Structures are given as C-alpha cells and as structure tokens.
Design a protein around this ligand. Structure first.
Ligand SMILES: CN1CCN(c2nc3ccccc3s2)CC1
Ligand code: NI
Length: 341
C-alpha cells in the first residue's frame, strides 16, 4: 500500500508510486526521474496517465515499453493545468530528465516536491523566486553535517587531469568508467573529450544514452569498442578480477587500465581532500573512487531550505527508522530557529 509521503493532499495525484498496484483515488501518477527505486512497478501493461519530463518519457517508451497513449511529457519552467490543478516542472540538478514539481492546490496551498535533487543557489532564480511554499517534500539523503563532498566541477577537474596524465605517460593505457543507472555522464564524457576519443559501450547502454537529449551525442559515443580508448562497463565489473578479464578481451591493444568508480559520499570524505585522493592498485590495474554526488550536501540542503522558508517539511529519504527521523527533525528545527521563519 502507498505510503502517506507519496500522496499529494487535495488532489488525485501521487509521486513515484508505481509499486503499490492501483492506488485508490489516483487520477494521475507523476514520475520525477528514471531511477529504479522511483519507477519500481512501471511496464508496457501500465494503463493510467503518467506525467513526467520529455527525457523521462523517452526512457519510459524505449526502455520500459510503456505505451505512448499513457505518456504525458510536460515542458520545464511552464505553467500547465493537469486534471484541473496548476503544476510546474523545474530542473532538479540530479540525473538527465529529473524534475521537482510545484503544485498549486485548489485551496491556495502551494507544495514543492523536490524528487531527488542537488540543491544549488541557481534554484533561487527559478520560478521559485518570491513564491510562498507551504509544504516541502524534501530529498533528505544527506541530511547530517558529516556529509561533505566537493563540487561536481572540482571532481571532474581531478578526473580529467588524472586520465590525461596517465595516458600521456603511457599511450597504451585504457581508461574504464563504471555505470549502473543514468546520471553522472559528465565523468566519462569529460575524460573522453580530453583524450580525443569517443566513449565505447554496450548496445543497451548506447540505447539508454540516445534517449537523453544530450547535444551532439552522435559525436561523443559509440558501440565500436575497438575504435575507443574510454570504455563503459557495469559498476559490478569495476574490480581487479573484472578489469583483468576485460583487458584480455582487448586483443593486446593495451597493457594498463586506469578505472573510475563514481560513488556518492563515502567515509574517506571525513579524512581525505579530493586533491590527495589515491587509487587502489594491483599490478597494471589502478581503481579510483571519486565522490561525484547528484544529491545535496548537508550545507547545500540547509541553504536551500533556509532560503525557501517552508511552513512544514516532509522527508522522502531515511524515513524508515526512529533514529533517522529524529535526527532530521532536530536539524529542521535548528534551521528554523537560526533563520527566524
Ligand atoms: C540504523 N541507522 C539509523 C541512522 N542512520 C541514518 N540516519 C540519517 C539521518 C539523516 C541522513 C542520513 C542518515 S543515515 C543510519 C542507519
Ligand atoms: Ni535518483
């Protein structure tokens, strides 16, 4: 059964609620983004209206084979009426196609649902500017002060400089990058750009990327592995065994692998600066864990919420334990007392 924090009161709407069968009273199902925990339950047999971004709709049609008659893409930054209620989709700064949803309820209440997001000061100059928001359904993934990590720009500078140095020292080195979902494409695109290569990948991953409206994508990616010196592999293969096995398949073209595992936050962020990050190495294979996050840091989350000044916050992540709920509630109250709302 569908939990309370996925229902929008005063409407027939749910958000990211496809794994609960027919939700009683639901006339429109919104999907914030194409990540499996959020789309869980969708398929070609789904027969209710789904509202989403254009990019999310391309993935629904081509990857999940949802019938076109049920896919309702909406443009961003545009007031739309859905089943008698005004809504707006805003860019979430998460993965491609990810949105936040503003709902203007018939009674005058305004609700913002962030979906998954990485809060940024640029959101302060979206259509949110000077918009009173009564209720905030908040991506609380990293809602504790220990969760620190660098900017995406800093992480990409590290990855580009590391890959360029390694391949310039050894032109027979291969670069490999792990993936298990959409998101974090800048990691492999930026490395391939500095090396003068297309990114090589499976047919299935190529299909996924073809759905993402990335400018000049045909110039950047390929299924011809032999033509490419930056390869994408499943995240599960980014280990010494998996990479040794891959190197064997490359027909003596390469004698070294440099691999990247984009993660979220890890406990080494409590000790080691991005500049000082070192790999794990065995023989001619080295593996870097890089903290490329598509969720708000604690500090980014706190700034956004203190700017927005919501009357009530409903967490959508870390909801399952009393300890995590109590921790989040304590921070919301600190933030409110500090800023005066
Ligand atoms: C059994 N543990 C319960 C507490 N835990 C977390 N609490 C929060 C709160 C806010 C952000 C993240 C977390 S993780 C870890 C698991
Ligand atoms: Ni997500």
């Amino acid at each position: 059964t569908c939990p309370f924090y996925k229902k929008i009161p005063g409407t027939g709407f749910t958000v990211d609620a496809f794994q609960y069968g027919v939700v009683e009273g639901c006339t429109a199902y919104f999907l914030t983004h194409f990540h499996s925990d959020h789309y869980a339950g969708l398929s070609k047999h789904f027969t209710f209206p789904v509202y989403c971004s254009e990019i999310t709709g391309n993935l629904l049609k081509n990857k999940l084979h949802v019938q076109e008659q049920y896919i309702h893409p909406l443009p961003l930054d545009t007031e739309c009426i859905v089943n008698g209620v005004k809504v707006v989709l805003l860019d979430a700064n998460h993965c491609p196609g990810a949105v936040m949803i503003l709902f203007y309820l018939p009674n005058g209440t305004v609700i913002l649902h962030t979906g998954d997001f990485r809060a940024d000061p640029s959101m302060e100059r979206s259509l949110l500017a000077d918009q009173k928001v009564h209720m905030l359904y908040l991506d609380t993934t990293y809602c504790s002060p220990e969760y620190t990590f660098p900017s995406q720009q800093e992480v990409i500078r590290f990855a580009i400089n590391t890959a360029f140095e390694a391949v310039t020292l050894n032109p027979h080195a291969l670069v490999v990058c792990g993936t298990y979902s959409i998101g974090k494409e800048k990691v492999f695109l930026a490395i391939a750009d500095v090396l003068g290569s297309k990114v090589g990948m499976s047919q299935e991953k190529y299909k996924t990327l073809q759905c993402l409206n990335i400018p000049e994508i045909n110039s950047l990616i390929t299924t011809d592995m032999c033509s490419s010196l930056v390869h994408l592999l499943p995240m599960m293969q980014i280990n010494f065994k998996g990479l040794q096995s891959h190197l064997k398949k490359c027909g003596g073209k390469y004698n070294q692998i440099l691999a990247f595992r984009p993660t979220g936050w890890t406990h080494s962020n409590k000790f080691t600066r991005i500049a000082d990050v070192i790999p794990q190495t065995k023989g001619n294979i080295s593996i870097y864990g890089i903290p490329y996050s598509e969720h708000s840091s604690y500090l980014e989350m706190k700034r956004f919420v203190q700017w927005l000044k919501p009357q009530k916050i409903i967490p959508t992540v870390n909801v399952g334990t009393w300890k995590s709920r109590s921790t989040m509630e304590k921070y919301f109250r600190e933030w409110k007392l500090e800023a005066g709302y």
